[PDB]
Amino acid sequence: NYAPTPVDRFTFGLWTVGWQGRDPFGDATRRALDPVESVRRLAELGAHGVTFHDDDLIPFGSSDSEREEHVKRFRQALDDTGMKVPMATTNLFTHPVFKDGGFTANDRDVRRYALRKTIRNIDLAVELGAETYVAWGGREGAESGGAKDVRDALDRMKEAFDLLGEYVTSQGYDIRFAIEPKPNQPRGDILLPTVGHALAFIERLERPELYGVNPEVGHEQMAGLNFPHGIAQALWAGKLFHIDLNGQNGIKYDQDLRFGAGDLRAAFWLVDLLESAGYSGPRHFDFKPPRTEDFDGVWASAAGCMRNYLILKERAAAFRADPEVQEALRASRLDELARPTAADGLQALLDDRSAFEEFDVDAAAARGMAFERLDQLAMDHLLGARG
Amino acid sequence: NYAPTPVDRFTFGLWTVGWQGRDPFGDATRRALDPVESVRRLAELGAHGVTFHDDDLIPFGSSDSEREEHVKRFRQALDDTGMKVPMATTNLFTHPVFKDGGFTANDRDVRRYALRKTIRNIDLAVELGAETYVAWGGREGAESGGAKDVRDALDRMKEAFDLLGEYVTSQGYDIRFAIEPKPNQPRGDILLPTVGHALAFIERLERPELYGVNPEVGHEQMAGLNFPHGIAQALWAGKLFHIDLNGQNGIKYDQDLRFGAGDLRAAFWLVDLLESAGYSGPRHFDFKPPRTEDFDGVWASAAGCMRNYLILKERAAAFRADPEVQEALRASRLDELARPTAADGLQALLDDRSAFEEFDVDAAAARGMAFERLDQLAMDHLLGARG
Amino acid sequence: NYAPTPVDRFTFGLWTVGWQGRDPFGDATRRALDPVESVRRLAELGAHGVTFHDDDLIPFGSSDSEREEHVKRFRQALDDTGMKVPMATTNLFTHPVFKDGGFTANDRDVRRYALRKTIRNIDLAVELGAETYVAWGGREGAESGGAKDVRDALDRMKEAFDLLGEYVTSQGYDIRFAIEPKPNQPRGDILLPTVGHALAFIERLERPELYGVNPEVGHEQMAGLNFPHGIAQALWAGKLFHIDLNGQNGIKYDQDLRFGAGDLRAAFWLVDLLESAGYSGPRHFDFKPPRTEDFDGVWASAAGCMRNYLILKERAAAFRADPEVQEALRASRLDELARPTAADGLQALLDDRSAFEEFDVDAAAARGMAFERLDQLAMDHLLGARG
Amino acid sequence: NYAPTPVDRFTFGLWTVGWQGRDPFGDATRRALDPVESVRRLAELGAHGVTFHDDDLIPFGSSDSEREEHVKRFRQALDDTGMKVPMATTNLFTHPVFKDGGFTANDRDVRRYALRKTIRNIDLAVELGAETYVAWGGREGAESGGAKDVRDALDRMKEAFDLLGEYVTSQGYDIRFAIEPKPNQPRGDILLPTVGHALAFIERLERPELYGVNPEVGHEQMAGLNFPHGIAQALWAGKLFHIDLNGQNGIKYDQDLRFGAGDLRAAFWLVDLLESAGYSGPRHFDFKPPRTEDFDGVWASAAGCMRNYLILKERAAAFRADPEVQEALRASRLDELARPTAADGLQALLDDRSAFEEFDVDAAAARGMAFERLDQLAMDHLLGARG
Ligand SMILES: [Mg+2]
Ligand SMILES: [Mg+2]
Ligand SMILES: [Mg+2]
Ligand SMILES: [Mg+2]
Ligand SMILES: [Mn+2]
Ligand SMILES: [Mn+2]
Ligand SMILES: [Mn+2]
Ligand SMILES: [Mn+2]
Ligand SMILES: [Mn+2]
Ligand SMILES: [Mn+2]
Ligand SMILES: [Mn+2]
Ligand SMILES: [Mn+2]
Ligand code: NA
Ligand code: NA
Ligand code: NA
Ligand code: NA
Ligand code: NA
Ligand code: NA
Ligand code: NA
Ligand code: NA
């Protein structure tokens, strides 16, 4: 039961199942995986595709001949399995040169290098068929207040993204960018810390249509925010170009638990929203099998990501299709929420005594919302305990 | 020392010093204050002005004659003291009718009433000379996932703000709106939970120039965010129309401590930013003297808000003016951060071997940022411990 | 399905279903309930009993004749329904006199009054058959560092609890005390902020056997802690005298959501632990139907507390009884965790080359824990998705 | 000004200034330091001593001859500088063998090895003159609920600490143990997550007098707790055997900022408490110079730890010595808090009409606490802004 299919579009970063287990306090617990191995094993589990940072696929500093051979082997694995590459990204965070940032490093020479490193990988992403190019600016930020003038850093961040937009336009590429917010870690505070901040920033770019967000479940939860609500705002803005699925237990370091772990009810409401809205992008997992696990546990954890999505999809669909739930939604006036407040227009509203002088505030206030019964129907559906 | 002056533009809500001390677990500890008393006492402390919700100035449900008398007495107090009213707002949160929201209540009749209540108070705000009209949507949100379709709620929130913009335009008013984010409390999650989300929303309004943000120190800190960074993004966007100053100890219920309490170093960096950027708006305190205090403690707490701002202003100015700090800022390349990455343009960057093939990444990575010495100069300046 | 029974021992505070909906920003949305009404309605839902603060049952300041009549009516309702009263507590937080504390108020006269108020209610609790007397010191703490010397406050807190222990011993009562930790709210920081701090404090009382903890799900989660882990430590110490069940979404104000809401997987692991350990005390709900609800929603929310406990009990029992789970627990070495490390004794351990010189650390490190497969079996059992 | 002296007893872990800068997302930015270098540089800054994990001083897996040479070189550096070694600890977290724990690993063979590794290093600590042996169980815990039975793990943790106590007793050593709590990171939840939980656990050991706590500023703040309050409880219990000083910005990953950074006012109240209580132990810094820094920044950051302690010591002493503050403390009844509630005894309290029938609750409730004026005097003293 709960078998992944190609139409599910489940994807995984090479760096997810390939995470060797090094953490702030501990050495690696697993050997490095050849990307070819990961492609073949993920395909066997029913995944649709993989994603990569440049330096996951091509060791940093590789010669041109080494780069060609790494890509050739990877493409053979994709061809052997039918796996796709819908998204790629740049590693602008691991190498010491990026310790104060890539696009917003105080040193101008580093900013220029970061752009050139990204541009090289955009070309490769396009060659591999990627539709989306993610940017997670994990080193953009500060540990102290004097170190980073945020207005100047935002100017540099806009300049960088504008140059990348000019680049893809000039090459006729169809790829689009997706900015991944995170509030902190590894910097004390990261620039563009939430979906909202990233959405706002995009509106000030020269070609805003080329940019959207890549929100990650656990990152919004590191600020204690409601991830489904943030996804709703991104969908409302037309900017949900990609998504990173995982689990997180609240306000901690970025745990990258398998999807469904962490906040299970938020996972339910997320799946309900994505499916109801008809989100058509990859269901991408940015997760880490815990370092306690051997490779059998790696593949079990990856399989669990997909399984949990599919269970939640079933339960959310059953919730929405249940005539008792539909009745409860009407009892709670969800239908009214979807109607305009004043399609009659401002003057009619100003002239409407039923909206002021003749509005019975105490009668209105007496009406219960019936939200608790609705939420218990949702719980019963999630748990398969209807009756 | 540290005496407030009119040019400081310190303002206070009537509901701040007037808070009677009722909390989720406790009854009021102080009697209600007449707004006239608060105006006169705040003026004696050196405040510039006050702000109000409709229902702070005019008891809810007042007749027209009662409304006139309350406003007349208030205006006499303002005239007697020289106090100004730069901002006003609507209470769309206390009355039970607003239990599921004002502008985004599921019930359409409530949404219409909320708009009419706001419009009536915009007229009064203009009559009192207010330049800014704040909206804190404290009841907009949910405790459960099925209760609120966030895309529909954002449609209703946009409709409401668009109608208000049409209203002020039609009346020829110069007032502008400032949306106040908060992540949670009193709703389990509040819509537009951070500065970023509010900035993004504004960009989708029909007349975006009429709307900005009113960020509150403690509200961003309830999501664990860096308040100075968020203010920098608002300034970068041209949207810092007003600000609420207070203190908060991290991720808790909204404490509304006096300004300078809570995160003292964030208060320092905030003042540094506001002064450096030339922010010209009110320095408004949205705070609550703790319920442990009698009225002498109320006025001490209000005086402390202003005193702490002025101490921090002095220390931040001394930091920025110190030639040793200026040298440290250059050592940390803050000057380079402010220079364009690639004013030479995209093609020149692509052709520049110094940005890629000839970039010595290991030499760059070896350069220290010297951020710790800079931050210790900042600490020494804050504490008055230079030497 | 999932029908409560008397052996379930589900109990509710009068103040839970009786919460009128006043919050930091909003007036009451529901009328006050007569305790008699609550007893009868809860009995109809299958509850076992209720609990009370003194001032929930007897209005503060009541005369002796008024007190007798309130108790008489309540006892008739208990007799009419078969409902029990297993626990009672004192309100040492609502009245303004307690603004700086009860037992740890700086004012000595207030500390003495708090003790006398508690002692009067202990007598009533015993008359009603209560086995446990809870103390939640919600006003014990501070908003500022100079206001409360914590060593002195702990001396006063110990003195108070020691006097109460002397009192019950002198009267021959069998009741025992349960201290309820909370980290903050309504004070900026509350003394004894977690289960651990309360357990440690108890060990320093004169008669430690008379005192245990009353942990509350949401309170430990307000510090981001693992509630099942804290309950395990309380059980390990022999100190889980009572428990408060509810839901919470992380690090926020105390939400008091119905049990099962908030962190659903933590609710699952809690029920698993309580049932596995054979906890025999009340399953008490300290929750608040949201103020959006009318009385039908109040009773739906209360019913949901019990329903969710019973669903989780079923799923946890099925998890533990599943031979595949039992095999997975052995694969993960949970059996070894339960065996002594060195029952052979210290000298044998020191002499055992297999523990040092001949321990193959790399072979040990290569063994996977298989925790992810175990956790996915747990997820499948919780969701009723085995297959 | 603010020059460290030997009587200040400032100490640093080898792993602090020696941190190479590897984080969850980034490679090392600094070369490894020879411990001899660190001893000499710290001595030049005015430090009193260093501390070490076994594997900081002796590379893991060293032969006996290699171990002797590493210790000999280290001791020469200590002799050359006058530096002391007051504390040592075991690394039971870096090596992959410890991925599920040391003392509470599910695998019994790992638990036995962890004990033998610790015992070997206790012998070395004693040879170097250490008075305290710290244990930070960073791998004790879980990412999932089924992986770790916490009651069984606490049994194993008690068994381990009891064996270590038997060991030191049998060898006649004067060293004592200090358990270092942390709530999470690197495990999803860590056992003994706070000062309170560790204090409670110690009370159940066979020889409780041999064990205390080593609280760390940032670790308690990762649960949003008040670090000065927790230190007060440890002092009240007689269990503050050692302390780790650093800075933290709230509920995040463990930042290990220099002391004084992070929550500056909590640092002030901590120093006030340690000095007022006469804490006589090391002022030990467990911090990490940010990876942005070169070695000059490492030493600047270490110097800043000591400087900030000394500034705060001066300001706290001036606060306590100021006759205006002493008057404010009396106005706030801090003197009464330190007096017994009922030295007259229980029967006298029960017979005292002034404690109940004749207690004027409304007159008591009207008295203000004057805490805001007291706290503003504290702020003025911290900032050197008295006047
Ligand atoms: Mg619709
Ligand atoms: Mg500039
Ligand atoms: Mg057992
Ligand atoms: Mg004393
Ligand atoms: Mn992540
Ligand atoms: Mn991601
Ligand atoms: Mn606030
Ligand atoms: Mn505000
Ligand atoms: Mn609670
Ligand atoms: Mn409770
Ligand atoms: Mn730490
Ligand atoms: Mn430490
Ligand atoms: Na700039
Ligand atoms: Na979209
Ligand atoms: Na709509
Ligand atoms: Na602006
Ligand atoms: Na005392
Ligand atoms: Na127990
Ligand atoms: Na055991
Ligand atoms: Na001590």
Task: Encode chain C in three state secondary structure.
Answer: CCCCCHHHCEEEEHHHHCCCCCECCECCCCCCCCHHHHHHHHHHCCCCEEEEEHHHHCCCCCCHHHHHHHHHHHHHHHHHHCCEEEEEECCCCCCHHHCCCCCCCCCHHHHHHHHHHHHHHHHHHHHCCCCEEEECCCCCEECCCCCCCHHHHHHHHHHHHHHHHHHHHHHCCCCEEEECCCCCCCCCEECCCCHHHHHHHHCCCCCHHHEEECCEHHHHHCCCCCHHHHHHHHHHCCCECCCEECECCCCCCCCCECECECCHHHHHHHHHHHHHHCCCCCEEECCCCCCCCCHHHHHHHHHHHHHHHHHHHHHHHHHHHCHHHHHHHHHCCHHHHCCCCCCCCHHHHHHCHHHCCCCCHHHHHHCCCCHHHHHHHHHHHHHCCCC
A375: contact with C, CB 8 A cutoff: yes
C196: contact with D, CB 8 A cutoff: yes
A371: contact with B, CB 8 A cutoff: yes
| Token digits of residue D64 | 């006996």
Helices (H), chain A: 14-17, 35-44, 54-57, 64-81, 108-127, 150-171, 195-202, 217-221, 227-236, 264-277, 295-321, 323-331, 334-337, 346-351, 361-366, 371-383
Residue pair C236/C212 in contact (Cβ under 8 Å)? The answer is no
Q: Which of D352, D337, B291, D361 is nearest to C55 (CA)?
A: D361
Q: What amino acid occupies position A149? A: D
C286 belongs to an annotated ligand binding site: yes
- CA of D312: how far to CAs of C32, D2, D266, D306, D379, in Å? 51, 10, 11, 10, 12
Closest-CA distance, B95 to chain C, in angstroms, reads: 6
d(CA D371, CA B249): 17
Residue pair B320/B273 in contact (Cβ under 8 Å)? The answer is no
Say which CATH topology domain D1-387 has.
TIM Barrel (3.20.20)
Closest-CA distance, A25 to chain B, in angstroms, reads: 23
Q: What amino acid occupies position C236? A: W
Domain locations along chain D = 1-387
A249: contact with D, CB 8 A cutoff: yes
Catalytic residue among B48, B54, B55, B56: B56
Radius of gyration over alpha carbons of chain C, in Å? 23
Contact A144 B371 (CB under 8 A): yes
- Mutate which of C246, C252, C379, C383 to disrupt the A interface (most A C-beta within 10 Å)? C383
Residue pair C287/C257 in contact (Cβ under 8 Å)? The answer is yes
- Write the residue in A188, A249, A292 that is nearest to D99 by C-beta: A292
Q: Considering only CB atoms, which chain B residues are within 8 Å of D385? A: 1-2, 307, 311, 384
CA of A254 to the centre of ligand 6 (A): 10
Q: Considering only CB atoms, which chain D residues are within 8 Å of C192? A: 196
- CA of D177: how far to CAs of A166, A214, B301, D118, D207, in Å? 62, 48, 45, 12, 11
Chain C residue with CA closest to B224: the answer is C251
- Mutate which of C221, C299, C376 to disrupt the A interface (most A C-beta within 10 Å)? C376
CA of A180, nearest ligand number = 6
CB pairs under 8 A between A and D: 107
D361: contact with B, CB 8 A cutoff: no
Contacts of A62 (CB under 8 A, 6+ apart): A70
Q: Which of A306, A151, C193 is nearest to B334 (CA)?
A: A151
C256 belongs to an annotated ligand binding site: yes
Q: Which residues pair with C87 in a beta bridge?
A: C51, C132
Secondary structure class of A86 (helix, strand, coil)? strand
CA of A286 to the centre of ligand 5 (A): 7
- Write the residue in C26, C94, C255 that is nearest to B188 by C-beta: C255
Strands A84-89 and B49-53: unpaired
d(CA C197, CA C219): 13
d(CA A382, CA A269): 10
In the block, residue with structure tokens 């739906």: C300
Residue pair D371/C144 in contact (Cβ under 8 Å)? The answer is yes
CA of C104, nearest ligand number = 17
Reported as half-sphere exposure (CB side, CA atoms, 13 A), residue D263 has a value of 29
d(CA D257, CA D248): 6
- CA of C305: how far to CAs of C4, C21, C346, in Å? 10, 18, 49
B312: contact with A, CB 8 A cutoff: no
Q: Which of A100, A236, D159 is nearest to C340 (CA)?
A: D159
Residue pair B188/B228 in contact (Cβ under 8 Å)? The answer is no
Q: Which of C166, A336, C187, C103 is nearest to B147 (CA)?
A: A336
C56 in catalytic set: yes
Closest-CA distance, C229 to chain D, in angstroms, reads: 6
d(CA C134, CA C180): 7
Supply φ then ψ for residue C53, to 5 degrees. -85, 150
Residue pair D243/D283 in contact (Cβ under 8 Å)? The answer is yes
Closest-CA distance, D41 to chain C, in angstroms, reads: 35
Question: Which method resolved this structure?
Answer: X-ray
Residue pair B14/B8 in contact (Cβ under 8 Å)? The answer is no
Reported as half-sphere exposure (CB side, CA atoms, 13 A), residue D162 has a value of 16
Chain C residue with CA closest to B144: the answer is C261
D258: contact with B, CB 8 A cutoff: yes
Helices (H), chain B: 14-17, 35-44, 54-57, 64-81, 108-127, 150-171, 195-202, 217-221, 227-236, 264-277, 295-321, 323-331, 334-337, 346-351, 361-366, 371-383
Q: Which of A205, A297, D368, D193 is nearest to C373 (CA)?
A: A297
Secondary structure class of A179 (helix, strand, coil)? strand
Supply φ then ψ for residue C177, to 5 degrees. -100, 150
d(CA A266, CA D358): 54
DSSP H/E element including D37: helix D35-44
Contact C379 A304 (CB under 8 A): yes
Q: Considering only CB atoms, which chain C residues are within 8 Å of A261? A: 265, 375, 379
C21: contact with B, CB 8 A cutoff: yes
Closest-CA distance, A94 to chain D, in angstroms, reads: 4
CA of C94 to the centre of ligand 9 (A): 15
Q: Considering only CB atoms, which chain C residues are within 8 Å of B253? A: 24, 184-185, 252-254
Give the CA dihedral B355, B359, B363, B366, nearest 10 degrees: 40
DSSP H/E element including B213: strand B211-213
Residue pair D300/B371 in contact (Cβ under 8 Å)? The answer is no
Q: Considering only CB atoms, which chain A residues are within 8 Å of B371? A: 142-144, 146-147
C64 in catalytic set: no
Secondary structure class of D134 (helix, strand, coil)? strand
D385: contact with B, CB 8 A cutoff: yes
Residue pair C160/D161 in contact (Cβ under 8 Å)? The answer is no
Contacts of D379 (CB under 8 A, 6+ apart): B260, B261, B304, B308, D385
Contact D367 B294 (CB under 8 A): yes
CA of C151, nearest ligand number = 17
C253: contact with B, CB 8 A cutoff: yes
Q: Considering only CB atoms, which chain B residues are within 8 Å of A100? A: 369
DSSP H/E element including B142: strand B141-142
d(CA C349, CA C345): 6
The catalytic site residues of A sit at 53, 56
d(CA D144, CA C375): 6
Chain C residue with CA closest to D205: the answer is C237
| Token digits of residue A341 | 């407040």
CA of A238 to the centre of ligand 15 (A): 14
Contact D379 B261 (CB under 8 A): yes
d(CA C313, CA C310): 5
Residues having C-beta closer than 5 Å to ion ligand 15:
A 338; B 152, 155
Residue pair D111/D160 in contact (Cβ under 8 Å)? The answer is yes
d(CA C197, CA B256): 27
CA of D118 to the centre of ligand 4 (A): 39
CA C99 to chain centre: 24
A277: contact with B, CB 8 A cutoff: yes
Q: How many CB atoms lie within 10 A of CB B344?
A: 12
Q: Which of B179, B228, B182 is nearest to B202 (CA)?
A: B179
Resolution (A): 1.2
D104: contact with C, CB 8 A cutoff: yes
CA of B108 to the centre of ligand 15 (A): 12
- Write the residue in A98, A138, A188 that is nearest to D255 by C-beta: A188
